[PDB]
């Protein structure tokens, strides 16, 4: 047993980094615009590109479109990739994020990449990054004694 | 050995469960700004959960400095990451 064991990151490709960037929402969701989000998208694109990722951005997709796109990526081969990264930049609450028109439960997105559903990522890191609110509590400042 | 089908996921959240997360209208979100700064500086050398912990510290140092709602002034945010990883993760130059 090797306490220093590392994932093998010597494949031909680093792998794909998907970014789902959501700035505006269907009027009836009553969600404000997310000014500054394209700054995040561009910042992430640069940093992940520099680490070797093939970065693919999608802007303001509807839920059906987003789910199709994520299903697509989960079914292509990652055999020659080190890992997989998926970023969501949006509104959220509870355990869901918003596409343009509807909420999506985070478990629906991650379930597509579980070992039995995505064989070529078995044994490889599957990294999800979520910028979104997760409820209506506003954390308060404290100081140590 | 076989592997669990649930293994080797890393879920990186900008804030802990149940909380608001903050976004600056020009610079972007607190979390992504600090994640990206740490990626730029340490991405190619530090272990990734080690790096995410630094992001936790950076974001925890921030506060709502100005706000139309005076009750929101000084409010805070701690990120949260969940690891089902089984090994050290590095992004050394390929």
């Amino acid at each position: 047993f090797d306490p220093a064991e590392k994932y093998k990151m010597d494949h031909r490709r680093r792998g794909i980094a998907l970014i789902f960037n959501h700035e505006r929402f269907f009027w009836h969701l009553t969600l404000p615009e997310r000014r500054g989000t394209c700054a995040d998208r561009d910042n992430l694109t640069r940093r992940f590109s520099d680490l070797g990722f093939e970065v693919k951005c999608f802007n303001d997709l509807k839920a059906e479109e987003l789910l199709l796109k994520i299903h697509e990526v989960s079914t292509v081969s990652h055999a020659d990739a080190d890992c997989f990264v998926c970023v969501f930049l949006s509104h959220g609450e509870g355990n869901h994020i918003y596409a343009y028109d509807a909420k999506i439960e985070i478990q629906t997105l991650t379930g597509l990449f579980k070992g039995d559903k995505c064989h070529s990522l078995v044994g490889k890191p599957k990294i999800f990054i979520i910028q979104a609110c997760r409820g209506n509590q506003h954390d308060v400042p404290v100081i140590p004694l | 050995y076989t592997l669990p089908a649930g293994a080797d996921f890393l879920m990186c959240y900008s804030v802990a469960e149940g909380y608001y997360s903050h976004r600056e209208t020009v610079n972007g979100s607190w979390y992504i700004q600090d994640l990206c700064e740490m990626l730029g500086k340490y991405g190619s050398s530090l272990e990734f959960t080690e790096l995410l912990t630094l992001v936790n510290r950076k974001v925890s140092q921030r506060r709502v400095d100005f706000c139309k709602d005076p009750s929101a002034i000084g409010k805070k945010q701690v990120p949260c990451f969940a690891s089902m990883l089984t090994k050290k993760l590095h992004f050394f130059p390929k």
């Binding site: 000014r35 509104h91 506003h138 | 903050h22 976004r23 709502v64 100005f66």
Partner: peptide, 4 residues
């Protein structure tokens, strides 16, 4: 600063 805005809330997500």
């Amino acid at each position: 600063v805005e809330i997500x």
